[model samples]
Target: RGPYVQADLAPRVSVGYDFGGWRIAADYARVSSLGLSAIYDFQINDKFKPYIGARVAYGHVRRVGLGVIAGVGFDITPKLTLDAGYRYHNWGRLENTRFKTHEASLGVRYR
Candidate 1:
């Protein structure tokens, strides 16, 4: 068997600031990775808004990577919203090695 690894269940935090329709944020976890991202939201109406963004991250083992994100959001209330998105990431080359991944996310926001 390989070396045993344990999972971390502690809460991770992502902090962001919104300026008009643009948002910038940073994220952190206990797994030794950190990320920064920027996004711009298109205000279509009071209930529907779409967004596009990109992110960059660095980790102890993963090194560096970049990704793109696209999502749509729905407003359930003035202070509550729901979002769904897709992301594609390309981890940079390390010697002869490279990695790529795809992700889908569902999120809730309270502002």
Candidate 2:
């Protein structure tokens, strides 16, 4: 059984610079919560790239969670890319809760 969960839609913005084969980025997401993240991307080839990222997030979930992410990006076109990622999140006891979250997401990037 699970408590009813309400969906959260947040506005997220990311700015990144790619040069040579490396990319660095920073993001801010706010709405259902406030989160800041930093990411590093390394290109393995034209169709494959791997990344590592982390975020510090605060939300109505009632805990401040630390998230670690590892993922890959696949290029579909020169202007579009698709991402698949796994995120692990943990929070120390807050408000009588021991929080943990694991999520996988598929997202698109357009340039």
Best by TM-score: 1
- The CA lDDT at 10 in model 2 is 17
lDDT of 2 by residue, 7-84 (tens): 112135554555434344444454356665555665567576787767677776364667777787677565555566
Q: What is candidate 1's CA lDDT for residue 53?
A: 82
Cα TM-score per model: 0.70, 0.59
Error of 1 at 55 (Å): 1.0
Model 2's alpha-carbon lDDT is 0.58
Question: What do the candidate models score in CA lDDT, each in turn?
Answer: 0.63, 0.58
Candidate 1: TM-score? 0.70
The best candidate by lDDT is 1
